[PDB]
Structure formats: structure tokens, C-alpha cells
């Protein structure tokens, strides 16, 4: 009874706990630095969890309303990478920061958009369908768009990103999805444990990244945070207008706004740690985005839940 309520609070106060661990790692780097080589395994557990909660019925909307899901997928991969490039150009960001921002923008959407849409009284089915499709196609789209925006000079790194996404995202999702088919309704007991496990895995990624880049956060941390807010914020703005201008209903307009603005920034932190390890600042936009988008996502979801 107490253990279940503890998980409920932690989930409903995530951003605060993520901010506390990021702060703990900042003032004391050695507290989390050990988790650095575990980043792929940690993200691998989060992705296993996503697939475990996935069922073939979650793709119903993709077969019944394919144009609506396709608009959401296009919005995601056109808006977030282009906004990351535009902000990198307009703010003349140092190359390492620009690469970290572009990486975040090229990532697929985050699963927390599903919960935020539910609170925003949006179309939940659509949110789940957009995140899942954009995630399943991310092994090809994430490095291809990264390559076009960051430059063809990072070919080697982008090719390695394809392999990294297959291993940390695709391999665990499919596995989870087949385990749900194998056990059926029995997977509910496993899915009760995942919110706390997933929160523990992500705070360790955040902690490990902040710790490894303390010096770079000390000189550029505020600039990265300002870009994160503008990247995510503009993502909500263009997301809303993309849903509105395509003639989508109000429920779909709220889902796509959140979908676009919210990113799988834990993947961006994982890809920067695996492929730009000698430059710890590349993983910083991803680590700070993971804390920020949950704060901005909840505030926007609260405004809509209060309106509806």
C-alpha cells in the first residue's frame, strides 16, 4: 500500500526528483559517474518497459486513421530537427552544443507525451501511436536527419547511431512487445514495477551525464538550458499550428502539440555518450531536456485539463 503510493508521488513529481539528482551530480560528480558505462543498459530497460506496455491494439488508429498518425510522425521529424538547426544557426552555438541540440531534435518523441496527452484531455490513442511509429522508424530517420543537419562530416558517428538505436531502442521494444503477447494480461504485474525502475534508470543517465560534464555545464550550462526551453517551446508552437492548419480536431491539436515538443532525450543522452564520448557537453542538451520537457509538458497539460 505504502510502496505503491511512493511510486505514484515520485511519478507525479518526476521533474523535481530528476532536478535533485542532476543537482546532486553537479555538486558531487563521483556520486553518479559510475553509471556512465551503464547508460545503454539503463535506456535499454526503459525501452523494454515501453514495448512491454505495448499491445497490437495500440496501432488500431494507424490502420483506421493513417493520415492522422502520418501527420503526427511528419510533424515530429520536420519540426524538432529543423527547430534545433534554426536555433543553432540564429544563436551561433559552439559546434559541440549545436551537435547536442541537433541530436535531441532528431530523436523520436518521448513516452511521457502519452501521459501528458491523457492529462491534457487529448486523443491518447493518437499519442501512443505517434510515439510508437516515430520510435520504430528512429533507427533510420534519427541518423539520416542528424547527418543532413549536423553535416556529412559525422557519417561514421551517424552510421554507429543506427546500430546504437537498433540495440537500445529496437531490440528492447520488440522483446517487450513479444513478452506482452506471450504472457497476455499477466504482464500487468511486470508493468507495475516499471514506473519506479524507469525513473531510477533515467535519473542515473541524467546523473551520469551531468557528473561527466560538470566543467562544461559550469561555463555553458545556462546557454544550453535557454536553448532547451526555446527548442521545446517552439516545438509546442509549431506543433499546434501544424495540427490546426492540417484541419485536425481540437483533441488531435493538443496531442500533436505535446507529441512534437516532448522528446526521447534519454536516447539523445545515450547517443552522445556512445558516439561523442570525448565531448561530454554533447550529452548535456539531452540530459537537461529530460528534466525540462516534463516541467513544460505538465504546465501545458494542466492549462488544458483546467480548460476542458
Ligand X SMILES: CCCCCCCCCCCCCCCCCCCC(=O)O[C@H](COC(=O)CCCCCCCCCCCCCC)COP(=O)(O)OCCN
Ligand Y SMILES: CCCCCCCCCCCC[N+](C)(C)[O-]
Q: What are phi and psi of 264, to 5 degrees?
A: -85, 75
Alpha carbons 265 and 46: distance in angstroms, whole number: 12
Q: Which does 264 bind (CB under 5 to 8 A by kind): Na ion, ligand X, ligand Y, none?
A: none
* Residue 123 marked ligand-binding: no
DSSP string, the chain: -HHHHHHHHHHHTHHHHHHHHHHHHHH-GGGTGGGGGGHHHHHHHHHHHHHHH--GGGGHHHHHSHHHHHHHHHHHHHHHHHHHHHHHHHTT--HHHHHHHHHHHHS-B-THHHHHHHHTT--HHHHHHHHHHHHHHHHHHHHHHHHHHH-GGGHHHHHHHHHHHIIIIIHHHHHHHHHHHHHGGGGHHHHHHHHHHHHHHHHHHHHHHHHHTHHHHHHHHHHHHHHHHHHHHHHHHHHHHHHHHTT--HHHHHHHHHHHH-B-HHHHHHHHHHHSTT-GGGGHHHHHHHHHHHHHHHHHHHHHHHH-
* Residue 111 marked ligand-binding: yes
Q: Which does 113 bind (CB under 5 to 8 A by kind): ligand TCH, ligand Y, Na ion, none?
A: Na ion
* Residue 264 marked ligand-binding: yes
User: Minimum CB separation from ligand TCH for residue 127, in Å?
Assistant: 12
The residue within the footprint of ligand Y, chosen from 72, 108, 139, 172 (CB under 6 A), is 172
User: Minimum CB separation from ligand TCH for residue 109, in Å?
Assistant: 9
Instruction: Report which of 87, 89, 128 is spatially closest to residue 110, judged by C-alpha positions.
Output: 128
Q: Does 41 bind ligand Y (CB under 6 A)?
A: yes
The residue within the footprint of ligand TCH, chosen from 248, 270, 273, 288 (CB under 6 A), is 248
Q: Does 249 bind ligand TCH (CB under 6 A)?
A: yes
Residues touching ligand TCH: how many (CB under 6 A)?
25
In angstroms and rounded to an integer, the radius of gyration of the C-alpha atoms of the chain is: 18
Q: How large is the angle between the packed helices 124-150 and 250-261, nearest 10 degrees?
A: 40
> Mask: binding to ligand X, 234-263, rule CB under 6 A, as x and -?
--xx--x----------------x------
Residues 218-237 that bind ligand X (CB under 6 A): 229-230, 233, 236-237
The residue within the footprint of ligand TCH, chosen from 46, 54, 73, 125 (CB under 6 A), is 46
Q: Which does 36 bind (CB under 5 to 8 A by kind): Na ion, ligand X, ligand Y, none?
A: none
CB 110 within 8 A of CB 293: yes
Residues 107-136 that bind ligand TCH (CB under 6 A): 110-112, 115, 119
Q: Which stretch binds ligand TCH (CB under 6 A): 55-63, 104-112, 159-167, 172-180?
A: 104-112
Q: Which does 133 bind (CB under 5 to 8 A by kind): ligand Y, ligand X, ligand TCH, none?
A: ligand Y
Q: Which stretch binds ligand Y (CB under 6 A): 1-9, 13-21, 152-160, 215-223?
A: 13-21
Q: Which does 303 bind (CB under 5 to 8 A by kind): ligand TCH, ligand X, ligand Y, none?
A: ligand X
Q: Does 184 bind ligand Y (CB under 6 A)?
A: no
CB 275 within 8 A of CB 157: yes
Kindly tell me which of 191 and 302 has the beta carbon lying closer to ligand Y.
302
Kindly tell me which of 124 and 237 has the beta carbon lying closer to ligand X.
237
Q: Which stretch binds ligand TCH (CB under 6 A): 79-87, 182-190, 197-205, 209-217?
A: 197-205
Q: Does 304 bind ligand Y (CB under 6 A)?
A: no
Which residues does the annotation place in the binding site? 111-112, 264, 266, 294
Amino acid at each position: 500500500n505504502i510502496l505503491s503510493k511512493i511510486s505514484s508521488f515520485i511519478g507525479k513529481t518526476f521533474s523535481l526528483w530528476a532536478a535533485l539528482f542532476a543537482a546532486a551530480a553537479f555538486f558531487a560528480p563521483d556520486t553518479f559517474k559510475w553509471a556512465g558505462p551503464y547508460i545503454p543498459w539503463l535506456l535499454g530497460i526503459i525501452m523494454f518497459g515501453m514495448g512491454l506496455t505495448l499491445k497490437p491494439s495500440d496501432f488500431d488508429i494507424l490502420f483506421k486513421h493513417p493520415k492522422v498518425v502520418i501527420i503526427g510522425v511528419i510533424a515530429q521529424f520536420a519540426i524538432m530537427p529543423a527547430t534545433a538547426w534554426l536555433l543553432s544557426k540564429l544563436l551561433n552555438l559552439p559546434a559541440e552544443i549545436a551537435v547536442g541540440v541537433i541530436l535531441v531534435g532528431c530523436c523520436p518523441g518521448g513516452t511521457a507525451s502519452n501521459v501528458m496527452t491523457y492529462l491534457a484531455r487529448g486523443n491518447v490513442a493518437l499519442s501512443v501511436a505517434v510515439t510508437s511509429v516515430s520510435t520504430l522508424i528512429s533507427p533510420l530517420l534519427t541518423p539520416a536527419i542528424f547527418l543532413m543537419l549536423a553535416g556529412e562530416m559525422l557519417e561514421i558517428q551517424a552510421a554507429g547511431m543506427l546500430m546504437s538505436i537498433v540495440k537500445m531502442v529496437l531490440l528492447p521494444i520488440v522483446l517487450g512487445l513479444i513478452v506482452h503477447k506471450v504472457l497476455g494480461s499477466k504482464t500487468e504485474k511486470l508493468t507495475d514495477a516499471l514506473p519506479l525502475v524507469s525513473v531510477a534508470a533515467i535519473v542515473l543517465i541524467i546523473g551520469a551525464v551531468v557528473g561527466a560534464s560538470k566543467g562544461k555545464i559550469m561555463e555553458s550550462g545556462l546557454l544550453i538550458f535557454a536553448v532547451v526551453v526555446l527548442h521545446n517551446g517552439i516545438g509546442y508552437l509549431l506543433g499546434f499550428f501544424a495540427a490546426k492548419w492540417t484541419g485536425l480536431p481540437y483533441d488531435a491539436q493538443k496531442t500533436l502539440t505535446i507529441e512534437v515538443g516532448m522528446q526521447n532525450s534519454g536516447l539523445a543522452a545515450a547517443l552522445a555518450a556512445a558516439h561523442f564520448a570525448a565531448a561530454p557537453v554533447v550529452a548535456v542538451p539531452g540530459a537537461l531536456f529530460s528534466v525540462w520537457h516534463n516541467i513544460s509538458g505538465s504546465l501545458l497539460a494542466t492549462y488544458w485539463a483546467a480548460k476542458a
